[PDB]
Design a protein around this ligand. Sequence first.
Ligand SMILES: *[C@H](CO)[C@H](O)[C@H](O)[C@@H](O)CS(=O)(=O)O
Ligand SMILES: *[C@H](CO)[C@H](O)[C@H](O)[C@@H](O)CS(=O)(=O)O
Ligand SMILES: *[C@H](CO)[C@H](O)[C@H](O)[C@@H](O)CS(=O)(=O)O
Ligand SMILES: *[C@H](CO)[C@H](O)[C@H](O)[C@@H](O)CS(=O)(=O)O
Ligand SMILES: *[C@H](CO)[C@H](O)[C@H](O)[C@@H](O)CS(=O)(=O)O
Ligand SMILES: *[C@H](CO)[C@H](O)[C@H](O)[C@@H](O)CS(=O)(=O)O
Ligand SMILES: *[C@H](CO)[C@H](O)[C@H](O)[C@@H](O)CS(=O)(=O)O
Lengths: 216, 217, 217, 217, 217, 217, 217, 216
Amino acid sequence: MKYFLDSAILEEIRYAYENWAIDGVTTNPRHIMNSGKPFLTVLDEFASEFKGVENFPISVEINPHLDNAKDMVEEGTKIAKLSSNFVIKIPCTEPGLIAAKEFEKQGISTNVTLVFSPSQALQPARIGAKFVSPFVGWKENSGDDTYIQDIVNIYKNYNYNTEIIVAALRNGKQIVDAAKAGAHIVTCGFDVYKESFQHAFTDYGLNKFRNAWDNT
Amino acid sequence: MKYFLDSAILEEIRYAYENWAIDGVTTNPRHIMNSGKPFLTVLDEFASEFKGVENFPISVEINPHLDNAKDMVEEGTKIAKLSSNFVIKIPCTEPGLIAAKEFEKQGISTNVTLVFSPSQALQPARIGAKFVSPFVGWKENSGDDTYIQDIVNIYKNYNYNTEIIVAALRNGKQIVDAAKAGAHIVTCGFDVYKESFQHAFTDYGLNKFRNAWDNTV
Amino acid sequence: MKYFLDSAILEEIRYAYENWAIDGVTTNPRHIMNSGKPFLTVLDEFASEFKGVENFPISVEINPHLDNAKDMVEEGTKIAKLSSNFVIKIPCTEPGLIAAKEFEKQGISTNVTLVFSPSQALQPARIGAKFVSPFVGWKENSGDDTYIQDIVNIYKNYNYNTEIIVAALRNGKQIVDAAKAGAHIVTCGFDVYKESFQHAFTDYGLNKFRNAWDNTV
Amino acid sequence: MKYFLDSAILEEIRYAYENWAIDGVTTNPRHIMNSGKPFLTVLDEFASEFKGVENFPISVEINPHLDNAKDMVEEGTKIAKLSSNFVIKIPCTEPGLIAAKEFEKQGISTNVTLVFSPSQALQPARIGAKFVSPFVGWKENSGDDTYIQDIVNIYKNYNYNTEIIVAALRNGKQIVDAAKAGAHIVTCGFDVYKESFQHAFTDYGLNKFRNAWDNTV
Amino acid sequence: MKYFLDSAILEEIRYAYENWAIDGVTTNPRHIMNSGKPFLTVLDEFASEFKGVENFPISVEINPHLDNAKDMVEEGTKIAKLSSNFVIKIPCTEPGLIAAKEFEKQGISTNVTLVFSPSQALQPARIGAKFVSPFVGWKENSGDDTYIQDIVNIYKNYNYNTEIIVAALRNGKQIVDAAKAGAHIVTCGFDVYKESFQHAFTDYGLNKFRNAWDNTV
Amino acid sequence: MKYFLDSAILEEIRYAYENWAIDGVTTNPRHIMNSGKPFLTVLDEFASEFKGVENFPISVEINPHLDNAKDMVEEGTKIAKLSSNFVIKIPCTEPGLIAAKEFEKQGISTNVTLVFSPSQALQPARIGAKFVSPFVGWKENSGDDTYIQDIVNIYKNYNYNTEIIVAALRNGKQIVDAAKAGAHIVTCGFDVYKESFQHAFTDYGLNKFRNAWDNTV
Amino acid sequence: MKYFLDSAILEEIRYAYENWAIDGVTTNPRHIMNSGKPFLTVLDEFASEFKGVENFPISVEINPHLDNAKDMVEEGTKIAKLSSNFVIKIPCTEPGLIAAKEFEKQGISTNVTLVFSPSQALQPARIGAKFVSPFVGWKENSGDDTYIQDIVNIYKNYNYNTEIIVAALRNGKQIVDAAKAGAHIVTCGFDVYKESFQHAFTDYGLNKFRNAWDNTV
Amino acid sequence: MKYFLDSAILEEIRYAYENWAIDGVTTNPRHIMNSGKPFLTVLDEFASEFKGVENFPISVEINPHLDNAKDMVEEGTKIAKLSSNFVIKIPCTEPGLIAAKEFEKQGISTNVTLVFSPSQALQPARIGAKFVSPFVGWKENSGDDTYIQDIVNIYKNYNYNTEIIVAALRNGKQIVDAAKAGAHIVTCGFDVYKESFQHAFTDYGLNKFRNAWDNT
Ligand SMILES: *[C@H](CO)[C@H](O)[C@H](O)[C@@H](O)CS(=O)(=O)O
Ligand SMILES: *[C@H](CO)[C@H](O)[C@H](O)[C@@H](O)CS(=O)(=O)O
Ligand SMILES: *[C@H](CO)[C@H](O)[C@H](O)[C@@H](O)CS(=O)(=O)O
Ligand SMILES: *[C@H](CO)[C@H](O)[C@H](O)[C@@H](O)CS(=O)(=O)O
Ligand SMILES: *[C@H](CO)[C@H](O)[C@H](O)[C@@H](O)CS(=O)(=O)O
Ligand SMILES: *[C@H](CO)[C@H](O)[C@H](O)[C@@H](O)CS(=O)(=O)O
Ligand SMILES: *[C@H](CO)[C@H](O)[C@H](O)[C@@H](O)CS(=O)(=O)O
């Protein structure tokens, strides 16, 4: 099970890598906006921070305004030529799935993102996408139950190599649901991961044990 | 199905009451801290705005440092005397369940809060608490699945009048889980309720119908 | 179980009303564009074809562009001064649910449409909407399974009077899915209803029974 | 639970009525062909045999070649006047469901037959058919499986008075499937009913009990 | 739940009636053979033992060689005159179901026995049999799983008054399956009932409680 | 839902009765060996403590060495004459069930205890025992899963008035299992009830709410 | 299936080894406040008793007041240098999981204890902890159902080598629940293991077999 | 699937071995009492009857009045030294499980009997007992449902070579419940096996075939 930090801040990407053993980092245009730094700056820092680090995927979304599968394959190329750890993140559109097939044919790893159905997720796997990111949190905010088990089961039944990155996770019970399903990776913010490692009954027992130690 | 606004901001309680038909405002020491106003001030403004309004439960938690059921029955009696809409919120502890049984015997409505198991929910029901608030969000943040259906089923099987207020709700899917269980009330923040009323397919269809209207005479 | 004809063509509305006993009619801006007639005319013709009839709800949607609950209240009030049978169809949005609550308070029947979750469907129920239309076909076209049973169960558990109109139905196993759930009404196009009444095994048996009748005096 | 004899032979109808307490008789153009007597003759005999008998429905299918409603309502209005026990059996076709609605409006009991889906069985109920005959054996000869629980559940959920007659039954285990579903009536041939009343373990026990009786005084 | 003693021994019938509150007694040609007394004597000691006792049914099987519904309604009528507590037990044969319908029409209570399927049992209920005895033990001895829940559910769904007597019971686990199904009566031998009232964890606790009582003033 | 205190200590019975609203008290021959006081001294303190209190059943087990239903019926009559609030507790054995039937016929309330099977629980209710105590903890200690739902269902199904007292409970999750089943009463020690009312997540929230209160003016 | 003795009393550790074949020993700061001997003494005894007994893990918890992962790694390195059988037990806290990752990198076996959620048992195995101890008893005492199957199923899927030690077990039914889930090890007190090996039906059969042996030559 | 004859009568053991292919024989102090012969006599006959027969286990229970693991590993050793087909049957008690662990260490096959829970069955497995006999008919005679499925499934999640000889079986329906679970052996008396091979619909068909054979 891989834990990808869904953040674009280096302080938290350095902490999680040295203390939590994160296996990768996913970013979206909103995480880079919240960074406060320009996009190219965030990329330069991420490229140097993990220059040598191998097997550390860094998903980076291309211009969200791109509408042609050809202006995507030419922008996500400039980007993929900035760091070998960079994985071009492309939305679940028709120009995106056409651009993700061309990218994968040229050997550029792609993460087909914004997938909200098991039918929007099968095509990315039939064009050899390295990663497919099915979103959970967004659908739930609108009162929809979150198809993740279906994608895991389909991927397995047809021996697909595409790795599923359950995204928009907001709590550790959703990490346990992704993991109960068999999802390959789970991407979550720094705080979702910290709270997932904590429990009130650990603090209760700690107080009971801290007492028995002080009475010995 | 009651929708209670979990907030201590009046401008939001004003809107939600005039547009969403909120059935009551729950609050906790953290919501009053985030209000930026002193506790007694928040109470006065809520005791005035909803002065005549009948059947608008306003749950207000007493001092969380109170450790004796006697110090509780005395602090919550004072708060309850400030408006008839106010429902004293007491934590599910020994000194809270003893204090909730007294208040309920004196006719002061009580909301036994911080309940995280169906065993902690049954005692509040056996002492005639008006409300019992089982929390969901907190347990989930620690990787625990959220016992709500058990409480609803137990309450129903034993004909208890205590109304269940599923609390710590963070999304509309958790509001749909509480409704599918049969919970009486669901307390959520203003933004959880707004997003629960919205869907992407409702913007998709409204673009398809907005274009059809433009190609019509 | 009510069968509403999802059509704006009076020629198919007239056939279904006499031969299939349809219980009502629903029209979206796209059906009134496919009619080929202007809207205010498709209206005049329904306002006259059913002037005598009552309990035959005719759902009709307002400018899919209106963004304010006030401008939505003014437009749907006028469209309702056209015929007692006219039920104003409003999208499940922020200003649509605010406009549907004001409409229902003035006694104008409303059909909160474009609902794609049980959470967007509970608020329409809370404000006393006459009808709530949960869409099925659109979600399926995008690979999503179609929450209809949840809405039926929630509506029933909380004794809501709002009648559920399963919409975007494309076949008769989807009409059988809505009936198995307990949905009140199902809205479908004329051809979905005709094919739902037919089966190949009925034509097989008919041929076997035709052969027997012939080999008999 | 009603047991209708699916036969046009009056030696089997007379036996089953006096010994098995059959509650009715269903016939199809193939049962009348196998009778060896002309259709009108079989009808005259059935009309006299049960002249006074009340509550004994005798389902009789009209010409299977009839393709128009107007021509169906005319051949069964004339088959109905030959006995008050006769129930016009009409195929689940467009012209058949239109003819079954006109018939039911004139007070002529109708049995909409050849129904092989729950979507085809709902319309007969939405037009007040006295009986709807969902078919089992035919669909299973072709490998398919038997919806005969969906129809029962739908009929019940919507309080329909139409009585379901599970037809094409070939064994008592299918009589037990229809009874477990809640079907109102089951129509079966004389031999299906006889074998359904018999078991090998009844003959085994009978031999064990016949042995003891002989080793007693 | 009623408990009928499946025995023809009056020392066991007398004990079970005074200590276990048995509600009736069922006998078969094999129980009378094992009695060691003549059938007539066993039938004249049961008549006197319960002369006045009301609501104490005593099921008595007629000659198992009877093959005609007539010679069996003549021999059975005879036994039914020798006491008002006697219920004629008739096998689930064709001549038996015809004879059980005639008897039930003359007001003689009948117990249609040797029923090994829910179809062999729906007919006894459609003719108004007072009791239907579905056998369990015999089918199990041959490796067949024991349809009892189906009969209970069918009887209930169609509001039948026939009372189900689960027979051939051999252990208390089978008495709890009949009860978990909703069977009206369970017939068992004296030893099956005694052991069903005992456990080894009741003897364990008794020893723990006897040790405590001793170590106490 | 009744909470009986499984204790013979009057400091815990008096606290539970005044703060937790216990509805009754159950005692076993070993909880008395533990009280330190002699048996009839324990009883006489219970009789005075609850002389006025009506409807507070106090289950008291008779001599566990009693082997005859006559000796048991002679000794439980004496104990029952020492208070109306006393309910004679009898083991589920042959002579205990015979003694419990005689006791119930004389109007002395009985609690048939040491029941470990759903089959041992049936004769108890088939003789009108006031209470039946199915034990859970003992069976679990030996690796056996704990039949309680079966007893609740069998009791409901055959509409029996005997009240089920789930006994040997050791944790609040077993109290939530009994409540989810529909058991009438649950008997537990003082500490099982205290811990059942407490949760670590209530102490967590209390600390979060105590920090917020301190930053509020 | 490994059975670790949750004890710090060497009379019980020595017995369980020589007679029950325990596969290891787990201890906590409260088991050592109960062993009387000071901590370092208990450790010296455990180190000598198992000086050359390979594959006998002895889990020993470090100072529970340690709040820094650096202070925990210094204290647990010292304890681990006292024996090769010793396994440093660290709480599932932020600094505990950081200290357990450093320990496992230096080759010191660690047992991440106090895990109550399956999201907490995931960082532990995503850092190569030798053991993860999910607690059951504590959660149950507060009325919470005990996620153990989820952890087992998550470890198998992702193929984590970390061995799960279900802790706080209190009966043999909870040992049978852990075994049915597929847990690697179960840690229990000496008395939980003794009672788990005993059953009242083994004493019943033993008495039946002892009576037979006596009535035999 | 092994069918052991739960009998101490050699006329029934001889018949079942030659006609039903029984794979073994289990006996208890009550079966030897009902034999009418002295215990040592029954043993001598069983030892000679199957002197050469290999892979024919004969479970023989020792004094039920023994409470010391030392007098039980001393009374078994003597019996086990009478025939190599003999398997010492020991009750699931503290001293029985201690005595079964000593026997199994000395290479004497043991059948830990009187097991009525899956917890009481796991210890016999953890000490290498050849056989474990979970009883069914005694628990059901008192109204308890019969765990035999979780003894089979735990003995499989943990690869235990102990073989489950499910005992106290009284009808063919339990010989089929045990088979549907995955029990290795099932012990039943001569007649629970005879009746299990017979059905009324085999006599019904035989009369149809028999009649259709006088019409041909
Ligand atoms: C990339 C998917 O692989 C992104 O990081 C994703 O947008 C979301 O995970 C997060 S959020 O909604 O923006 O929080
Ligand atoms: C009262 C319960 O009835 C409170 O408003 C409650 O604390 C929580 O609902 C919310 S949060 O965790 O503080 O968001
Ligand atoms: C109104 C809902 O009550 C409409 O008629 C609805 O849009 C859809 O039912 C149909 S479609 O997708 O336009 O076919
Ligand atoms: C009428 C239905 O109510 C008929 O009798 C029906 O065709 C079938 O039941 C029988 S068969 O296939 O012709 O045997
Ligand atoms: C009557 C049925 O009501 C009989 O008593 C029945 O045969 C069987 O219950 C018993 S047995 O197989 O003969 O034991
Ligand atoms: C009476 C049953 O109603 C007793 O109080 C019972 O023995 C047990 O509940 C408790 S324990 O095992 O002795 O703890
Ligand atoms: C270590 C976990 O591996 C301990 O021994 C644990 O605390 C608990 O198992 C037991 S108790 O609650 O202290 O009884």
